Structure 1
Amino acid sequence: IVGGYTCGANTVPYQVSLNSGYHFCGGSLINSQWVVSAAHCYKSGIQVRLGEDNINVVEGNEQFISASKSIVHPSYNSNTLNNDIMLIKLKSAASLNSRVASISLPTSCASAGTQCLISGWGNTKSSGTSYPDVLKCLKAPILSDSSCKSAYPGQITSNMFCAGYLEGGKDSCQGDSGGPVVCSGKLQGIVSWGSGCAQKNKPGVYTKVCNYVSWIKQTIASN
């Protein structure tokens, strides 16, 4: 997260870190057994880390649970990043509490201008690199589809939205991938892609979760 703020420990209780020896992606807890992340975060050997603030220090509220199964969206295209969504099932149920909690799925799509919370352990610099240990946060609005399409000609599908600031300075970045965009208590986006980070006229692009709720529910119901 570039241009954000320190969230505060366990203030984003649905935020997960995906670990394969190291943090490599975020995700969102949507019930005691399932995480939603980006398909471009797929790999084998995932351990889900819940209850994290400092990802390099055991602070007392963590739950580390290995993934049993990952399900990349049937129609994910890694070239275009269309349908950039994946579900991860935990080998055992998390113990839900005030610091480890699910986030609700949307019941309808969000509109341009809606204020959302974007979070993660990604790079905090727009030029150069610095990786935080504690969770970072950014409040950002959803941008109109027309401004999104204008920013990225030929690249924005009906399964994507832009959020952030066209002036630049404030954005998600490498290592935030797969993490949440939450708006009024609903998971509306997943950190997906962009051109660099926090660049003028290049806002972050996010998977449009509301299009996937039926797939998520039916996948959970049979897995």
Structure 2
Amino acid sequence: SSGSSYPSLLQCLKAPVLSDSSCKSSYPGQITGNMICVGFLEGGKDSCQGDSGGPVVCNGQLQGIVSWGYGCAQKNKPGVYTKVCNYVNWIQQTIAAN
């Protein structure tokens, strides 16, 4: 249930993976190798609170998990996503043993 602010209906957004240099420049001192920026440096389109944990899927592959950002859809503050292509072995080994 959507409560006081969330939408009832699932929302969709097309957005491109951003260069790591743009990601680090947007978030100086805050980007690790386990993070990728996806979205628009001009703002206006982004994920937001309540989206975390959800998918970023590119060419049929899960590449990102909604994680964090400064505000939502803010200029020069794109979404920051957990970099899934760092974790296939963690995922597969955890599933295999649990």
Contiguous gaps of at least 5 residues in structure 2: none
Counterpart in the other structure of 2:16: 141
Give the C-alpha shift of residue 215 in structure 1.
Answer: 0.7
Unaligned runs of 5+ in 1: 1-21, 24-55, 57-128
**Which residue of structure 1 aligns with residue 32 of structure 2?**
157
What amino acid sits opposite 2:35 in the alignment?
Answer: M
The amino acid of 1:167's aligned partner reads E
Per the TM alignment, residue 130 of structure 1 is displaced from its structure 2 partner at its CA by 3.9
Pick one of 28, 45, 62 that aligns with 1:187. Answer: 62
CA distance in 2, matches of 1:131, 1:216: 29
Q: Does 1:170 align with 2:38?
A: no
Q: CA deviation at 1:131?
A: 1.9
Matching residue of 1:215: 90
Query: Secondary structure of the equivalent of 2:87?
Result: helix
Secondary structure of 1:148's aligned partner = helix
* Root mean square deviation, CA, Å: 1.5
Structure 1 residue matching 2:82: 3-state secondary structure: strand
1:1-223 aligned within 5 A:
22=1, 130-223=5-98
Which protein has the bigger helix share? 2
- Secondary structure of 1:140's counterpart equals strand
Task: Extract structure 1 runs of 4+ deviating beyond 3 A.
Answer: none
Q: Which has the higher strand share?
A: 1
Deviations 1:118-168 (A, max 9, x none): xxxxxxxxxxx8421000000000000000000000000000000000000
Per the normalisation by structure 1, the TM-score is 0.43
Report the TM-score, using the length of structure 2 for normalisation: 0.95
